[PDB]
């Protein structure tokens, strides 16, 4: 019985993101996650998902969801992914 | 909403058709994309 809309702003609508080596993590809990409003906050170049359906998402529950915010170069966008290698994947941010 | 509606809009009823605000200045993700679905039915049916 929770009706507080989740603050999906302050991450996508944020003015300036954090550095790569200092990626910020925001704890998100005690809310109703409406992922439909994310598609209209900003254009999307890639919306890859791992293990979870990109569309069948508004009908699930989560213990804790952490949004990692960082800006990388355009040629290294393929590096942020589970199991990938590179400078960012080794010294800046590595996904399990 | 639960209140009945009419030919005009209301606080609890709106038009189901929304317009696309397609603008060439939008980045990748909001630009218009044409989709052509070529449905095929390949089977033992008489092919034309």
């Amino acid at each position: 019985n929770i009706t507080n809309l989740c603050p999906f702003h302050e991450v996508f609508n944020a003015t300036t993101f954090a550095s790569v080596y200092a990626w910020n993590r925001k704890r998100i809990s005690n809310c109703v996650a409406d992922y439909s409003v994310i598609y209209n906050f900003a254009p999307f170049f890639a919306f890859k998902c791992y293990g979870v359906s990109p569309t069948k998402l508004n009908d699930l529950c989560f213990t804790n969801v952490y949004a990692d915010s960082f800006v990388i170069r355009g040629n290294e966008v393929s590096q942020i992914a589970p199991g990938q290698t590179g400078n960012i994947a080794d010294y800046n941010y590595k996904l399990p | 909403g639960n209140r009945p509606c009419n030919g005009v809009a209301g606080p609890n009823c709106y038009s189901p058709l929304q317009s696309y605000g397609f603008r060439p200045t939008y980045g990748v993700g909001h630009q218009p994309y044409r989709v052509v679905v070529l449905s095929f039915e390949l089977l033992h049916a008489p092919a034309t």
Partner: antibody
Amino acid sequence: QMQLVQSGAEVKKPGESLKISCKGSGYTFSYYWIGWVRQMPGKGLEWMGIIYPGDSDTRYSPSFQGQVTISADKSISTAYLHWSSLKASDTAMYYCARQGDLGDWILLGYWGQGTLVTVSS
Amino acid sequence: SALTQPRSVSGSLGQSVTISCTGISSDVGGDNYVSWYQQHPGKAPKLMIYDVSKRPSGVPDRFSGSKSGNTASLTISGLQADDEADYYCCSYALSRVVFGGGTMLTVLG
């Protein structure tokens, strides 16, 4: 030196849809976000929106999504303002602002001299 | 959120005074999205304080500030005749710049 001189003051009747412009110089008017700020006489500043010179991407405040439209001309480095259905309460001072290399893209670094818009019958 | 400021403040020449600024939001990347502008009567506002830990070029060093939760303050040392003007604090964390209700700085003489 960099200059952001705007157009002269104007006085029109409600419903004439006047146009205000601003001429910038001293910098590359292709990559710096430029916008306008509205201020009524005796009150605080009210930001309306901004525009990018390279591509006409516009970001409007929720209180100015349809009350005013912003356009720019990269070929002459001139921004423009246009209104529709001017009301009696729409008269206010309008200040322009640019991004600048001081802070972020949204931080207003430099300001113009201001253009007074008078609306009365 | 909307920024709130004291409408009228008082001071004196050669003394120090502080201007409060409340209602500042916070986004991912820090809470330093606070800026100040000074607008003389009949003139355009001038950027005096942005990235409060820093100051722009040409701005006198007598202006300074600090952050404390959701409330910011602007400190001025050595009030002079040219300091008698309006001041507006601005927040730009949510990709939207908002301004307070304005402040009126008066000094005795």
